[PDB]
């Protein structure tokens, strides 16, 4: 139903037929980025839950696949699976944890 990701459709009558109006979703403006499959932090491999790791040259972010919404890398949207000596192309970066500052502030 149309070109692109389908959103809605509307029917109309026609002489000996039907006519569909397909409302779709087409991405428009693109931008190059540098990506990595996983992040080696503290000897652990962090993989994104949903989205993809990108970088703007200096800092690393994680974003959704079909839109540029960069977020800081956190243990909430990444998960751990094994050591970082088996993934080809893994880079080095830190991963924020929101539990630790609140736990230190309660002390």
């Amino acid at each position: 139903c149309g070109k692109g990701y389908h959103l809605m459709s509307f029917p109309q009558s026609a002489p000996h037929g039907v006519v569909f109006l397909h409302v779709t979703y087409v991405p428009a403006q693109e931008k190059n980025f540098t990506t990595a499959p996983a992040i080696c932090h503290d000897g652990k491999a962090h993989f994104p839950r949903e989205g993809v790791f990108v970088s703007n040259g200096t800092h690393w972010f994680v974003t959704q696949r079909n839109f540029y919404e960069p977020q800081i890398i956190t243990t909430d949207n990444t998960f751990v699976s094994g050591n970082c000596d088996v993934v080809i192309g893994i880079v080095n970066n830190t991963v924020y944890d929101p539990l630790q500052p609140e736990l230190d502030s309660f002390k």
């Binding site: 991405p27 094994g82 080809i88």
Partner: protein, 99 residues
Amino acid sequence: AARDLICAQKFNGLTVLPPLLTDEMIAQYTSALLAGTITSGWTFGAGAALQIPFAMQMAYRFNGIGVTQNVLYENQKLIANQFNSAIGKIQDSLSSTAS
């Protein structure tokens, strides 16, 4: 001295027209589709081509069947070897059997 049926079909008014798209253009369309689906994935069918590494869109394609993407990144070489062996077996099956 060995007359074929093609001249007899020709001499009775039964002609065969050539197709509009020659096989060179069909091969060009097939090569365009392969080069689109290798370097971009499903993105070249919606809008423009969106470049992505192959081992990352394969991990995208494991997420569509209910398998997490660490399975690829810890077993990339074995899956590549299995794909190459399957391609070679397809080649041998097409070379041997003509039916």
